[PDB]
């Protein structure tokens, strides 16, 4: 639990402009490192237990600021921004199957670490594309994995998050590690379609559809069966039927040995002008049904 002085940080944006949980890009002056700083109401000493987590696919802890009223957590800064912002930009047009496979494996490997390999078992509960960021060499890094335990006030809006939330999380039901499998499924769908899940729908409406109606995001008819089946396994209503992250990694490895899949997936990825209408038709249907 290395302490970093507030005076040892150069902030690049003003740090008084955000809600708790806001993250600011900063320079750690004494170490000449670019860092992220999350603003917190206060920091539990017990958060020490997460300070020892370390994996190439999770954001790296650096220290804590402990000078009331200024509290925060300092981590590495991933130079290329959030996965969400990348996906929903025109830059994601450069993604091919090898790109998606690498990034899907990155996130699955970080979550497997959190669930099974870390000194403390971590169930994220808030995994989403805005909580994954891209390092300078393209490695993805999961953020906010300690929020649900140690600074729940940062997480809650909640309406924004309902596309990524497992039904059992939405209902405050018994929750297992496979709530993160469901969320990961959504992140994979975002990478494949490069669309905002349930775009333009009210969050309460999403939660209702997902929980009571077993509604799930539209998988385009031309999506390769291997990806579609993986999405369906992640999205099972019964959380005990969802795959672990070890199983997901195994599936990804089997898909990477399928010599027919690069052509099928790249053709699907570059065919967005044709299948985008299948997603928009579902959204029109869902919006009209609410009316
Ligand atoms: C666009 O936003 C970003 N672009 N590039 C980025 N790189 C890093 C971040 C971040 C972060 C961050 C942070 F500054 C503090 C904490 C956390 N996550 S945490 O609260 O779950 C955490 C992580 C590790 C140890 C402990 Br203790 C707590 C974080 F994820 C955000 C970005």
């Amino acid at each position: 639990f290395v302490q970093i002085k507030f005076d040892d940080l150069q902030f690049f944006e003003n740090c008084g402009g955000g809600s708790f949980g806001s993250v600011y890009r900063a320079k750690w002056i004494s170490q000449d490192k670019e860092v992220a700083v999350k603003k917190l109401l206060k920091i539990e000493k017990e958060a020490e237990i997460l300070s020892v987590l370390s994996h190439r696919n999770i954001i790296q802890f650096y220290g804590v600021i402990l000078e009331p009223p200024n509290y925060g957590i300092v981590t590495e800064y991933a130079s290329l921004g959030s996965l969400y912002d990348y996906i929903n930009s025109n830059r994601s047009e450069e993604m091919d199957m090898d790109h998606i496979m690498t990034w899907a494996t990155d996130v699955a490997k970080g979550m497997h670490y959190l669930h099974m390999e870390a000194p403390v078992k971590v169930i994220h509960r808030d995994l989403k594309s805005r909580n994954v960021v891209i390092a300078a060499d393209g490695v993805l890094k999961i953020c906010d994995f300690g929020a649900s335990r140690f600074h729940n006030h940062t997480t809650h809006s909640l309406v924004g998050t309902f596309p990524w939330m497992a039904p059992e999380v939405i209902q405050s039901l018994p929750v297992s590690e496979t709530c993160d499998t469901y969320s990961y499924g959504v992140v994979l769908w975002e990478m494949l379609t490069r669309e905002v899940p349930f775009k333009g729908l009210e969050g309460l409406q999403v939660a209702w559809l997902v929980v009571e109606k077993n509604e799930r995001l539209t998988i385009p008819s031309s999506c390769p069966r291997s990806f579609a089946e993986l999405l369906h396994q992640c999205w099972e209503a019964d959380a005990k039927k969802r795959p672990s992250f070890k199983q997901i990694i195994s599936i990804l490895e089997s898909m990477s040995n399928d010599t027919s899949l690069p052509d099928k997936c790249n053709s699907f990825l570059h065919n967005k002008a044709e299948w985008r209408c299948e997603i928009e038709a579902t959204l029109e249907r869902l919006k009209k049904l609410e009316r």
Side-chain angles (χ1 to χ4, degrees), residues 1-155 158-201 203-287 290:
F1 228 39
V2 170
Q3 181 191 338
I4 298 170
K5 300 286 263 188
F6 181 87
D7 213 45
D8 197 17
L9 288 162
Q10 178 203 142
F11 286 91
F12 282 117
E13 63 245 14
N14 62 226
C15 80
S19 24
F20 297 112
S22 295
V23 164
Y24 304 95
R25 196 176 52 90
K27 265 299 267 308
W28 189 4
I29 296 166
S30 67
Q31 295 285 334
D32 197 14
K33 294 200 259 188
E34 189 179 50
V35 300
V37 183
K38 179 182 304 281
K39 159 172 262 290
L40 266 22
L41 171 54
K42 207 174 159 284
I43 287 172
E44 287 174 54
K45 313 105 139 108
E46 284 74 13
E48 270 176 345
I49 69 179
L50 291 190
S51 82
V52 294
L53 302 203
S54 188
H55 187 269
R56 66 175 54 184
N57 296 121
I58 75 173
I59 209 64
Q60 178 56 62
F61 174 82
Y62 286 167
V64 290
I65 308 160
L66 297 172
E67 290 162 73
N70 298 324
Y71 287 94
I73 299 175
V74 187
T75 73
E76 100 190 88
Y77 193 83
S79 309
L80 298 185
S82 76
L83 179 61
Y84 180 87
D85 288 341
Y86 174 91
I87 286 174
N88 291 115
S89 73
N90 287 314
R91 190 174 310 269
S92 55
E93 284 296 301
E94 77 192 353
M95 287 196 296
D96 66 346
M97 194 226 53
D98 179 70
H99 189 139
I100 310 267
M101 293 296 296
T102 300
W103 273 6
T105 300
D106 277 346
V107 177
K109 278 174 177 157
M111 292 303 316
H112 176 71
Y113 172 79
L114 290 170
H115 284 178
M116 298 297 286
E117 303 179 322
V120 172
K121 198 224 184 49
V122 177
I123 291 180
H124 197 301
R125 299 181 202 73
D126 199 26
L127 183 60
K128 60 178 91 130
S129 57
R130 289 191 206 78
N131 277 357
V132 184
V133 294
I134 313 160
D137 60 356
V139 176
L140 297 187
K141 314 271 191 180
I142 301 161
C143 299
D144 302 353
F145 52 81
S148 68
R149 184 164 17 191
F150 281 100
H151 42 92
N152 204 239
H153 63 272
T154 65
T155 75
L158 185 48
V159 147
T161 308
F162 286 117
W164 293 265
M165 299 178 41
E168 64 275 16
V169 171
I170 292 168
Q171 298 165 268
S172 300
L173 265 30
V175 160
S176 74
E177 78 183 24
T178 66
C179 68
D180 293 332
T181 292
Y182 182 102
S183 301
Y184 170 91
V186 179
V187 172
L188 180 54
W189 181 95
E190 297 174 80
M191 289 198 293
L192 291 163
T193 64
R194 297 94 75 196
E195 286 292 305
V196 168
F198 291 120
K199 202 200 182 81
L201 269 53
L204 251 217
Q205 186 44 233
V206 169
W208 152 256
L209 288 157
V210 160
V211 160
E212 183 60 42
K213 299 304 178 193
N214 300 313
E215 184 79 15
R216 299 295 183 265
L217 297 160
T218 298
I219 299 169
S221 48
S222 67
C223 186
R225 237 176 248 286
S226 285
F227 283 99
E229 299 312 300
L230 177 54
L231 292 173
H232 283 308
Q233 291 190 3
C234 293
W235 290 340
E236 289 281 351
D238 182 0
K240 292 290 167 192
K241 304 290 178 266
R242 293 174 208 154
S244 70
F245 279 100
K246 178 270 187 72
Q247 285 170 313
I248 288 169
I249 294 168
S250 184
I251 293 172
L252 291 175
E253 285 177 13
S254 294
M255 292 164 64
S256 76
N257 294 325
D258 183 354
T259 50
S260 68
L261 185 57
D263 285 348
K264 294 171 175 180
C265 175
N266 287 327
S267 169
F268 161 72
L269 289 170
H270 313 319
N271 203 13
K272 176 157 181 184
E274 214 166 35
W275 53 253
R276 192 200 169 211
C277 311
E278 290 173 41
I279 297 173
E280 278 292 317
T282 299
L283 290 170
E284 300 162 17
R285 165 188 157 268
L286 297 181
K287 284 173 202 168
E290 246 25 72

